[PDB]
Design a binder for this molecule. Structure first.
Ligand code: W9O
Lengths: 300, 237
């Protein structure tokens, strides 16, 4: 089990760790989060009590280094930092644990939610979507725009998701205009899977990372990316059977985890009704269609 | 964006543009089978592609052979339309290609956009106007050349005849749309009006009779009456 210590909590803040969250009062004695499961990426995120604007946070993998949080009063935010001095870190953590000034990553043993939301998400791919190579962890916030959004303005602070555009020369083979636009299998299987992502795991990892950024930060461009990647599969007549079965599982756990009161902004009516009821794969997502119908029957 | 009443005069500026109407591309007769089921039989159709400033009608005839062995023909028809419009643009030299293509039905936007990805600088636009171009097959010479075609064929007509020698584009387009609106509301009456007077002939390469200016004013007045009337005869007013 790993730990992310906090130097202090000088400003009142709601802290998130994966799908959990807790309130920390201004100058409350809080020195971090312990018992974080090894083997998964994680996200630690923040919403100030004073400015619920800008949710922000950090994607990290404790196997890649010792990370801590420290408030910066100049830039006005909780910053993730790496401690290279391993004995300094072990010593700080042990003191904070001995004084029981840490909250425990509160995982129920039966609960595979986080695994199921991050199954294909790798730190190395996160770091290519979020470019800041001097750090092993990746900052994301509510306002960051995607590379595709920038085409339609600071490139250093962008989410470099894979550009998907259904009315693009990349998506449409000369002479198969109608064929490729109505059946996007070429674009999914040849252009994106074989060509760009290399395999369906990398595709699913970007899909899951886009969902998580949409959910935890209300990041609009991420939500667009998540729906585009769903739609590209559902609108392909020819999809490997294992991809469809896994997609159904992926979306099931995303829909299960979504806050009941955010579905109005995070779920695109057109994509979901098209995907579940008109698309080639309308019959292939049984788990996802059942949870969607029982939990968001209005959207449909 | 959408062409409408507000930006109407843009049609007559010096930016090359084409209207595309696909209404008459896929045309069928519906009939009973010997077993008493219903079937369709396709007949020849046409794409109506019109430069409204110059009067150029690029009539692409759609021969029934293009539907052989195909499914979902109403959907194919929109993509076939887009394919032929794209081929037309590509055939043209650069300075003669359109800057905008205005489609009369919104369902043509995505098929034409996709076929024109090679031309990102050509704007593909819808319109809110309810233009009467479906009635093009009520023009005898156009209907005749479509029905006689035995293969795919592009036929060229000036839909304004020689009008532009005496009137402006704007006025010529208004005359055309009035004639077509009339033909669409009551084809029989409309055609009676146009041909009532035997002395007024149609020139070999024209579509409409050789009216004098004063005769056009009378004709135009009669077409308005017809359209107003059929509006009563339809709504009882
Ligand atoms: C290729 N531009 C078209 C011209 C064809 C030859 C004669 C002048 C133009 C004819 N108009 C009539 N309707 C169709 N176009």
């Amino acid at each position: 089990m790993n730990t992310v210590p906090f130097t202090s909590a000088p400003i009142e803040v709601t802290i998130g760790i994966d799908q959990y969250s807790f309130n920390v009062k201004e100058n409350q004695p809080f020195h971090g989060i312990k018992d974080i499961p090894i083997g998964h990426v994680h996200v630690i995120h923040f919403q100030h009590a004073d400015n619920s604007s800008m949710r922000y946070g950090y994607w990290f993998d404790c196997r890649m280094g010792n990370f801590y949080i420290q408030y910066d009063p100049k830039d006005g935010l909780y910053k993730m930092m790496e401690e290279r001095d391993g004995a300094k870190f072990e010593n700080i953590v042990h003191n904070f644990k001995e004084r029981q000034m840490m909250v425990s990553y509160p995982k129920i043993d039966e609960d595979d939610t986080w695994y199921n939301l991050t199954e294909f998400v790798q730190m190395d791919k996160i770091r290519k979507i979020v470019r800041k190579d001097e750090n092993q962890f990746s900052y994301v916030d509510s306002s960051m725009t995607t590379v595709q959004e920038n085409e339609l303005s600071d490139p250093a602070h962008s989410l470099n998701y894979t550009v998907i555009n259904f009315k693009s020369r990349e998506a449409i083979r000369p002479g198969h205009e109608m064929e490729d636009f109505l059946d996007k299998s070429y674009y999914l299987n040849t252009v994106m899977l074989q060509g760009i992502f290399k395999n369906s795991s990398n595709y699913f990892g970007e899909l899951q990372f886009a969902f998580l950024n949409a959910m935890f930060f209300g990041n609009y461009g991420s939500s667009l990316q998540w729906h585009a990647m769903i739609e590209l599969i559902c609108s392909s007549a020819t999809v490997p059977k294992h991809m469809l079965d896994k997609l159904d599982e992926i979306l099931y756990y995303q829909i299960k985890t979504l806050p009941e009161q955010y579905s109005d902004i995070l779920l695109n009516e057109r994509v979901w009704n098209i995907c579940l009821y008109s698309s080639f794969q309308k019959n292939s997502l049984h788990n996802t269609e059942k949870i969607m119908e029982n939990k968001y029957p209005e959207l449909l | 964006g959408a062409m409408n009443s507000s930006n109407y005069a843009e049609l007559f500026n010096n930016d090359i543009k084409l209207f595309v109407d696909d209404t008459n591309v896929y045309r069928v007769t519906v009939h009973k089978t010997f077993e008493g089921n219903v079937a369709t039989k396709a007949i020849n159709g046409c794409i109506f592609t019109l430069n409204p400033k110059t009067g150029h009608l690029f009539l692409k005839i759609i021969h029934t052979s293009v539907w052989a062995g195909q499914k979902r023909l109403s959907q194919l028809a929109k993509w076939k339309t887009a394919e032929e419009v794209s081929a037309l643009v590509r055939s043209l030299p650069k300075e003669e290609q359109p800057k905008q293509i205005i489609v009369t039905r919104k369902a043509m936007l995505d098929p034409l956009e996709v076929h024109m990805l090679d031309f990102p600088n050509i704007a593909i636009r819808p319109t809110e106007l309810r233009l009467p171009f479906s009635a093009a097959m009520s023009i005898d010479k156009l209907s005749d050349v479509v029905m006689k075609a035995t293969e795919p064929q592009m036929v060229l007509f000036n839909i304004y005849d020689d009008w532009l020698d005496r009137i402006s584009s704007y006025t010529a387009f208004s005359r055309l749309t009035l004639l077509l609106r009339a033909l669409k509301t009551n084809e029989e009456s409309a055609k009676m009006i146009l041909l009532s007077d035997p002395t007024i002939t149609i020139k070999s390469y024209h579509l409409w009779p050789s009216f004098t200016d004063e005769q056009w004013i009378t004709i135009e007045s009669q077409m308005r009456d017809l359209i107003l009337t059929e509006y009563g005869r339809k709504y009882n007013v």
